[PDB]
Paper text:
While β 2m is highly stabilized by the interactions within the MHC class I15, when β 2m is released as a monomer, it may turn into the etiological agent of dialysis-related amyloidosis, a condition triggered by renal impairment and the subsequent chronic accumulation of abnormally high concentrations of β 2m in body fluids. β 2m deposits in joints, bones and muscles, lead to movement impairment, bones fragility and articular pain1617. The introduction in the DE loop of a residue endowed with higher conformational freedom, such as Gly, relieves the local conformational strain and results in a β 2m variant thermodynamically more stable in solution, with a decreased aggregation propensity. The three β 2m surface mutants that we rationally designed (V85E, W60G-N83V, W60G-Y63W) were produced as recombinant proteins, purified to homogeneity, crystallized, and their structures determined at high resolution (1.75 Å, 1.49 Å, 1.70 Å, for V85E, W60G-Y63W, and W60G-N83V, respectively).
By calculating the change in the protein intrinsic score upon all the possible single mutations at these seven sites, we suggest that the V85E β 2m variant should reduce the wild-type aggregation propensity, while two alternative specific mutations in the W60G β 2m variant (W60G-Y63W and W60G-N83V) are expected to weakly (the former) or largely (the latter) increase the W60G aggregation propensity. Indeed, the score of V85E β 2m is lower than that of W60G, the one of W60G-N83V is comparable to that of the wild-type while W60G-Y63W is slightly larger than that of W60G. In fact, in W60G the side chain of N83, which is located on the F-strand, although surrounded by two charged residues (E36 and R81), does not establish any hydrogen bond with the neighboring residues; thus, the N83V substitution leaves both the conformation of residue 83 and of the surrounding side chains unaffected. Conversely, introduction of the Y63W and N83V mutations (added to the W60G mutation) did not vary significantly the Tm value recorded for the W60G mutant.
Residue numbers in the entry: 0 to 99
């Protein structure tokens, strides 16, 4: 058996074809096993609607999750990603850094 804790990156992107759109992204990468819970949070509250979740695996069976959705950030709001995984003794919460 193998277990590997996910790497977690939280960042924002505009599609180049439409700069009127801002997306918040959680890239959860390289994890074993694939069982996982991933949420985006705004000011500590779960964002229910997340339009996109792209899931893949590598040759060695590691999982790669891109979880992302359109959002309209203000300087006031705190965004974060909350991950629950067998490798984590408590849920891991990773904040969005505004300048990313």
């Amino acid at each position: 058996m193998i277990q590997r804790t996910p790497k977690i990156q939280v960042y924002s992107r505009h599609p180049a074809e439409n700069g009127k759109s801002n997306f918040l992204n959680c890239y959860v990468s390289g994890f074993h096993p694939s069982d996982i819970e991933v949420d985006l949070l705004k000011n500590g509250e779960r964002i229910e609607k997340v339009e996109h979740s792209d899931l893949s695996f590598s040759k060695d069976g590691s999982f790669y999750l891109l979880y992302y959705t359109e959002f309209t950030p203000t300087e006031k709001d705190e965004y974060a990603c909350r991950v629950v995984h067998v490798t984590l003794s408590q849920p891991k919460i990773v904040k969005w850094d505004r300048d990313m």
